[PDB]
Amino acid sequence: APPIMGSSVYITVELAIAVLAILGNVLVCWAVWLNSNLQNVTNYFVVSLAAADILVGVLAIPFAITISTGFCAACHGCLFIACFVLVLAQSSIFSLLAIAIDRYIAIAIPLRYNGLVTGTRAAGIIAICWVLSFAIGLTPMLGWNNCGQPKEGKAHSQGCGEGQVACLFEDVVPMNYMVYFNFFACVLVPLLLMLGVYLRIFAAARRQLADLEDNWETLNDNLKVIEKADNAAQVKDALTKMRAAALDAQKAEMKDFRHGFDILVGQIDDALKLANEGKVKEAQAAAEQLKTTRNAYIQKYLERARSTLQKEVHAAKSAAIIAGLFALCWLPLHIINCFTFFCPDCSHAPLWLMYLAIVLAHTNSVVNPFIYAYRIREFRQTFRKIIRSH
Ligand SMILES: CC(C)CCC[C@@H](C)[C@H]1CC[C@H]2[C@@H]3CC=C4C[C@@H](O)CC[C@]4(C)[C@H]3CC[C@]12C
Ligand SMILES: CC(C)CCC[C@@H](C)[C@H]1CC[C@H]2[C@@H]3CC=C4C[C@@H](O)CC[C@]4(C)[C@H]3CC[C@]12C
Ligand SMILES: CC(C)CCC[C@@H](C)[C@H]1CC[C@H]2[C@@H]3CC=C4C[C@@H](O)CC[C@]4(C)[C@H]3CC[C@]12C
Ligand SMILES: CCCCCCCC/C=C\CCCCCCCC(=O)O
Numbered sequence: 001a002p003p004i005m006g007s008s009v010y011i012t013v014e015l016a017i018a019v020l021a022i023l024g025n026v027l028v029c030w031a032v033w034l035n036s037n038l039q040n041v042t043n044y045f046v047v048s049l050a051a052a053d054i055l056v057g058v059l060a061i062p063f064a065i066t067i068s069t070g071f072c073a074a075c076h077g078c079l080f081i082a083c084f085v086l087v088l089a090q091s092s093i094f095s096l097l098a099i100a101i102d103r104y105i106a107i108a109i110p111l112r113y114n115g116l117v118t119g120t121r122a123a124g125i126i127a128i129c130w131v132l133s134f135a136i137g138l139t140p141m142l143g144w145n146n147c148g149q150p151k152e153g154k155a156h157s158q159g160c161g162e163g164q165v166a167c168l169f170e171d172v173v174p175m176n177y178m179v180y181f182n183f184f185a186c187v188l189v190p191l192l193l194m195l196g197v198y199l200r201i202f203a204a205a206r207r208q209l210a211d212l213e214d215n216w217e218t219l220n221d222n223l224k225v226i227e228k229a230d231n232a233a234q235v236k237d238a239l240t241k242m243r244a245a246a247l248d249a250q251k252a253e254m255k256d257f258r259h260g261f262d263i264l265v266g267q268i269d270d271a272l273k274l275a276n277e278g279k280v281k282e283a284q285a286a287a288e289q290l291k292t293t294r295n296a297y298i299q300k301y302l303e304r305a306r307s308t309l310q311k312e313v314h315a316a317k318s319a320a321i322i323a324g325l326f327a328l329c330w331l332p333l334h335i336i337n338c339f340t341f342f343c344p345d346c347s348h349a350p351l352w353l354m355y356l357a358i359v360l361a362h363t364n365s366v367v368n369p370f371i372y373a374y375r376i377r378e379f380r381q382t383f384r385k386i387i388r389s390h
């Protein structure tokens with residue numbers, strides 16, 4: 001059948017993806033520009049990620065449509081339009097890894113986050129990652145290419161000139177670069193690292209929620225121990241444990257919360273002094289006053305601390321879904337290259353499956369805007385206001 005028909009479907013789908021990639025991600029940038037609650041270090045990597053997706057529609061997809069024709073071109077000029085999508089993919093990987101590392105620092109050392117992770121440092125990391133993305137993505141133009149061994153028979157059949165070749169991705173880009181350098185080293189290793197970071201994020205959230213529920217249980221259990229205690233020494237032991245737990249909890253409205261721990265520790269010292277003197281019932285009476293402090297202040301510190309950890313877990317899930325959808329969208333194309341490279345006895349995957357795998361990789365530049373909308377209320381509400389006014 002005529003090649004213009006099957007290519008028309010591929011081209012039409014590519015252009016539809018480009019439109020959606022530009023529209024959705026332009027909205028992400030316009031949301032972060034306007035709303036100050038979205039202006040933070042995390043979302044500066046989101047903007048860098050959205051910028052890469054905008055460039056996929058404006059340049060990469062036009063490039064991909066061009067290299068599918070096999071048009072005559074200078075080999076090094078063909079390399080650039082073939083490799084530019086590798087630059088944008090590498091930029092996305094750096095932004096996805098930075099987002100993960102940003103969320104691990106947030107939950108692992110929240111007290112040192114704002115001093116450690118600032119906006120100026122984020123902007124410099126973003127600039128460095130783009131320079132490295134060009135270096136990694138355009139490595140074939142530094143000599144690791146097939147321009148030295150051009151397919152002259154195919155170039156003659158298409159009437160290409162001297163120094164020109166039929167511009168096709170797999171004719172100019174070497175497969176050992178695509179499998180070993182690009183996929184294994186620059187894509188797969190970073191993605192595995194992301195997995196480990198998110199594993200350490202969810203493990204750190206689980207341990208911190210459990211510790212909160214341990215401290216809360218220790219206070220209530222030791223209160224019951226004091227109630228049913230028979231001697232002052234038993235009261236002393238329970239209060240000594242309770243004081244350490246409260247001071248550890250204090251380490252982890254805010255003024256009204258620290259005033260609650262001031263009352264709690266002080267109240268424990270009141271009962272502890274009576275216990276050391278030997279006055280049991282007075283110590284037990286003083287220990288029951290802790291319950292009023294528990295209800296008014298401590299239970300509020302628990303429920304707010306627990307809510308904050310859950311909002312960090314939910315945010316880390318949203319970020320992990322984005323990174324996971326990147327892998328799902330790009331892995332088919334990379335897996336096909338492994339078959340081409342490692343199994344020379346296998347038949348090359350058919351042209352229609354190549355186009356489908358290429359289209360799937362480009363579709364990843366459309367999905368992030370939808371994930372933010374469904375999973376992040378601040379982005380969702382800013383999208384409504386932008387769309388309504390305009
Ligand atoms: C600022 C941005 C938007 C401008 C982008 C310019 C792009 C379109 C330019 C920069 C380099 C150019 C390529 C450089 C060399 C060649 C070899 C020639 O035999 C065919 C055209 C081709 C393949 C060019 C296509 C267009 C190209 C990719
Ligand atoms: C990434 C997740 C979703 C799974 C991806 C699975 C895809 C990429 C795998 C599953 C089965 C694979 C195919 C199995 C058999 C062949 C026949 C061989 O002669 C060419 C490659 C080809 C056509 C493989 C291409 C890649 C393939 C389609
Ligand atoms: C953690 C996961 C996603 C990493 C990616 C798995 C990749 C590297 C694996 C999964 C299936 C594998 C392929 C399965 C079958 C064949 C056919 C064989 O004749 C050559 C190796 C080759 C082509 C393998 C290459 C590597 C491969 C593509
Ligand atoms: C083929 C050439 C490849 C390079 C394409 C780049 C063209 C320029 C397009 C977008 C650059 C965006 C710069 C954004 C400035 C920083 C945003 C900000 O912090 O305010």
Ligand SMILES: CCCCCCCC/C=C\CCCCCCCC(=O)O
Nearest residue numbers: 057058059062065066069070071072
């Ligand atoms: C902001 C929008 C940017 C502009 C995008 C322009 C869309 C270009 C679409 C397809 C480019 C195809 C170029 C021609 C392919 C080579 C044909 C040939 O010479 O054999």
Ligand SMILES: CCCCCCCC/C=C\CCCCCCCC(=O)O
Nearest residue numbers: 123124126127130131134135138141
């Ligand atoms: C042969 C290629 C070798 C690499 C050379 C470098 C090419 C240019 C690379 C990146 C351009 C700079 C983009 C920086 C954007 C950062 C925006 C910001 O946050 O301030």
Ligand SMILES: CCCCCCCC/C=C\CCCCCCCC(=O)O
Nearest residue numbers: 124125128131132133135136137139
């Ligand atoms: C594949 C290409 C790799 C080439 C090696 C890259 C070298 C650059 C590495 C790290 C750059 C770090 C930024 C240093 C600037 C000063 C930072 C600061 O002021 O604290």
Ligand SMILES: CCCCCCCC/C=C\CCCCCCCC(=O)O
Nearest residue numbers: 183184185188189192341342343344
């Ligand atoms: C983090 C995972 C990435 C590292 C995976 C390491 C796997 C080692 C890679 C290759 C091992 C042997 C390759 C076999 C040689 C055949 C090459 C060929 O067919 O041309």
Ligand SMILES: CCCCCCCC/C=C\CCCCCCCC(=O)O
Nearest residue numbers: 346347348349350351352353356357
């Ligand atoms: C999420 C839905 C999952 C289904 C996706 C459907 C897309 C097609 C998937 C695999 C197609 C495999 C085609 C095998 C080509 C074999 C070529 C040959 O004859 O040797």
Ligand SMILES: Nc1nc(-c2ccco2)c2cc(Br)ccc2n1
Nearest residue numbers: 064085086169170333334337358
């Ligand atoms: N074999 C092959 N791999 C790729 C590719 C890029 C990243 C991973 O794989 C590719 C990309 C475009 Br865009 C067009 C054709 C392609 N062909």
